[PDB]
Amino acid sequence: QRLVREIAQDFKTDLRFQSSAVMALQEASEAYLVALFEDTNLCAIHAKRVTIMPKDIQLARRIRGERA
Amino acid sequence: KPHRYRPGTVALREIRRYQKSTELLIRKLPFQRLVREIAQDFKTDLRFQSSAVMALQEASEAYLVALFEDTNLCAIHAKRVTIMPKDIQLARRIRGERA
Amino acid sequence: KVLRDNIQGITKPAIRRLARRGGVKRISGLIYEETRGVLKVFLENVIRDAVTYTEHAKRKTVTAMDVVYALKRQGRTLYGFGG
Amino acid sequence: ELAGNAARDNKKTRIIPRHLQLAVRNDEELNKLLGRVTIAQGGVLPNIQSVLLPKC
DNA sequence: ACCGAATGACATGCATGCATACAGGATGTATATACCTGACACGTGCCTGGAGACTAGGGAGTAACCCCCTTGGCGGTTAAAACGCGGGGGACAGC
DNA sequence: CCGTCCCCCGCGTTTTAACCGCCAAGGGGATTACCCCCCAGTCCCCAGGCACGTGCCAGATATATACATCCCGTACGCACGCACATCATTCGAT
Numbered sequence: 001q002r003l004v005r006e007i008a009q010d011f012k013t014d015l016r017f018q019s020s021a022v023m024a025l026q027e028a029s030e031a032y033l034v035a036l037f038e039d040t041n042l043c044a045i046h047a048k049r050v051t052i053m054p055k056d057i058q059l060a061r062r063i064r065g066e067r068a
Numbered sequence: 069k070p071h072r073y074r075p076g077t078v079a080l081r082e083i084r085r086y087q088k089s090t091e092l093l094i095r096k097l098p099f100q101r102l103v104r105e106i107a108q109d110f111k112t113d114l115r116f117q118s119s120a121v122m123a124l125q126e127a128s129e130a131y132l133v134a135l136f137e138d139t140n141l142c143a144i145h146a147k148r149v150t151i152m153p154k155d156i157q158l159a160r161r162i163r164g165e166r167a
Numbered sequence: 168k169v170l171r172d173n174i175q176g177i178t179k180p181a182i183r184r185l186a187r188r189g190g191v192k193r194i195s196g197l198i199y200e201e202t203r204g205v206l207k208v209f210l211e212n213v214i215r216d217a218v219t220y221t222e223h224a225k226r227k228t229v230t231a232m233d234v235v236y237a238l239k240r241q242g243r244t245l246y247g248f249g250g
Numbered sequence: 251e252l253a254g255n256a257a258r259d260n261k262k263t264r265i266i267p268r269h270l271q272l273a274v275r276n277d278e279e280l281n282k283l284l285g286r287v288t289i290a291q292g293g294v295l296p297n298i299q300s301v302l303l304p305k306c
Numbered sequence: 307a308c309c310g311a312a313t314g315a316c317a318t319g320c321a322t323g324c325a326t327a328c329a330g331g332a333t334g335t336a337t338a339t340a341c342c343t344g345a346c347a348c349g350t351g352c353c354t355g356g357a358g359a360c361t362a363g364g365g366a367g368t369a370a371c372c373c374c375c376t377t378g379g380c381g382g383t384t385a386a387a388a389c390g391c392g393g394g395g396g397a398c399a400g401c
Numbered sequence: 402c403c404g405t406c407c408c409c410c411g412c413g414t415t416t417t418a419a420c421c422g423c424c425a426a427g428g429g430g431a432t433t434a435c436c437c438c439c440c441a442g443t444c445c446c447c448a449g450g451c452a453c454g455t456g457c458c459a460g461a462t463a464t465a466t467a468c469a470t471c472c473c474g475t476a477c478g479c480a481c482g483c484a485c486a487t488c489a490t491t492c493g494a495t
Binding site for chain 5: 016017018019049050051
């Protein structure tokens with residue numbers, strides 16, 4: 001709730017936030033993060049490793065196309 | 069006696085050539101025959117309008133090329149040079165079509 | 168001792184938990200940073216649109232439906248909160 | 251403008267789709283709008299991965 | 307313990323490995339040249355559809371009010387974050 | 402295949418800052434009223450654009466030639482180890 005208020009202040013000033021609208025961002029971000037996580041393993045296991053490193057999370061976000 | 073290029077020395081040349089070029093690569097005749105073959109199942113004796121067929125060719129190569137370039141990266145990510153099918157499965161997996 | 172960027176308010180163990188839900192076994196230390204940046208990037212788009220609908224409606228208050236509409240734009244629909 | 255510019259930069263005065271593809275993919279700002287669509291006879295941008303380069 | 311015979315160490319002869327720079331020479335590419343014409347560029351209709359001017363009636367824009375729900379604050383506990391660390395096994399490089 | 406480390410992991414402290422529970426204010430979101438002014442609706446119309454022809458051009462298209470480049474061989478250095486004789490050590494005789 002602090003974080004959203006901080007970032008939103010850049011785009012505009014004095015945004016009172018409806019309480020219900022808040023938890024949505026977590027859930028949407030959570031699943032997006034969760035989805036972005038699982039596929040990273042497949043990238044990781046593909047190189048026969050077990051630990052994920054950021055070069056993979058960059059590669060994964062490319063194949064989806066979002067990196068560009 | 070005759071000169072021989074080293075392995076891969078030739079291969080990179082076509083890379084440069086083909087990306088510069090912008091024409092189709094599949095043989096024209098078989099592709100029109102194949103689409104007729106597959107389309108036969110959905111509907112009997114359909115007539116393919118002549119201009120329509122190459123459109124399927126154009127998209128297919130465009131769709132195809134996108135696959136290999138993507139499958140190329142993971143092979144490098146796998147510290148390899150040659151692609152094998154397991155890469156394409158992965159690439160198709162990540163985009164979300166195979167799964 | 169909380170006055171700083173709230174991005175660091177996203178504690179490292181919280182990330183460690185999410186990796187588990189995605190089935191990640193082992194995590195290197197360097198992940199915790201780009202994950203912040205990557206997540207940071209994600210907010211930038213959604214709120215921008217979320218702000219846009221609100222101010223277009225002249226509303227000073229961001230409401231729930233504004234969120235799902237923008238989320239629908241990015242090809243990620245959200246069941247459960249209206250519409 | 252970009253297409254007409256680049257085709258002229260290639261010593262050609264008639265605009266053709268190969269020129270047209272080059273402008274869109276070379277400007278990221280437009281690449282966002284046209285990332286989805288591909289153009290007939292577009293041709294791929296000249297690109298080779300660095301690791302593919304010769305060992306020396 | 308120094309003198310010989312013998313032998314290991316020392317010093318270098320010998321041969322080799324390896325690197326490197328080149329020059330060749332071959333091939334592909336770029337240049338360098340004519341002809342060629344499918345094919346852009348007008349050019350001429352020809353009409354239809356966009357503009358002008360007309361009325362009519364509702365939807366957007368105002369004021370106006372309200373109350374709730376957002377924001378603010380305000381202690382208490384305590385669960386979770388932060389920290390230390392010991393180490394082992396995952397990455398990773400090399401053959 | 403081998404190995405190799407280090408750098409994440411569990412685990413123990415322990416700090417705190419979320420989390421709670423409560424209290425308050427008022428901004429403002431939500432709701433109503435008025436209405437005028439604004440866009441849709443018609444009629445007429447007229448010229449912009451479109452369908453068709455048309456050629457000319459240059460855009461192409463083909464020619465021949467020069468140049469750029471790559472690979473292999475070549476040579477050549479060199480620093481090298483192996484091999485070698487010699488220098489220095491060692492066992493026997495002294």
